[PDB]
Amino acid sequence: TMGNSTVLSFCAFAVDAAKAYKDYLASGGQPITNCVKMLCTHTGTGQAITVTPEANMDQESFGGASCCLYCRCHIDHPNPKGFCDLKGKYVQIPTICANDPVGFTLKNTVCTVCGMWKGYGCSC
Ligand SMILES: [Cl-]
Ligand SMILES: [Cl-]
Ligand SMILES: [Cl-]
Ligand SMILES: [Zn+2]
Ligand SMILES: [Zn+2]
């Protein structure tokens, strides 16, 4: 197992950091650790990204920036305005995937309707 700094550096300087992290994970690499876990009641709304921790009974809440590959790699976010949708907020991760919050936020998308993760919490 490589070390967070080794993994993050490798992704940070790749032309496509997300691809590099996804390909590492698919090869069996250990997920990036030391994300900031929140203590919370687990009777929250279950929404994916919120101003305060909102985990329901099936989720864990994390500090948003600590689960953001771009934030963890100190690089720009892959959009024009460069705004980060996780920084300063709290991200709800299904506990099944809580061993890899960085990879989870990367791969998934918040349902525009119910504000929950598509394919997990989203029951639309
Ligand atoms: Cl390391
Ligand atoms: Cl700890
Ligand atoms: Cl969810
Ligand atoms: Zn970020
Ligand atoms: Zn939905």
Numbering used by the authors: 7 to 130
What did the published study say regarding this structure?
The coronavirus SARS-CoV-2 protects its RNA from being recognized by host immune responses by methylation of its 5’ end, also known as capping. This process is carried out by two enzymes, non-structural protein 16 (NSP16) containing 2’-O-methyltransferase and NSP14 through its N7 methyltransferase activity, which are essential for the replication of the viral genome as well as evading the host’s innate immunity. NSP10 acts as a crucial cofactor and stimulator of NSP14 and NSP16. The two zinc fingers are thought to provide structural stability to NSP10 although their detailed function remains elusive.
To our surprise, T12I, T102I, and A104V were still the most frequently occurring mutations, with T102I displaying the highest mutation count. T102 and A104 are present on the proximal and the distal ends of the short helix H5. Crystallization experiments were conducted for the three NSP10 variants but only T102I variant yielded protein crystals. The structure was determined by molecular replacement and refined to allow comparison with wild-type NSP10. Both structures overlay with an RMSD of 0.26 Å. The only observable difference was the loss of a water bridge interaction between the hydroxyl group in the side chain of T102 and a water molecule. For NSP10 variants T12I, T102I, and A104V, the measured Kd values were 1.46±0.38 M, 3.88±1.39 µM and 2.37±1.36 µM, indicating that as observed for NSP16, the variants either show values very close to wild-type NSP10 or display slightly better Kd values (0.37–0.99 fold). In summary, this signifies that the three variants have only marginal effects on the NSP10 binding affinity to NSP14 and NSP16 and show either the same or slightly improved affinities for complex formation.
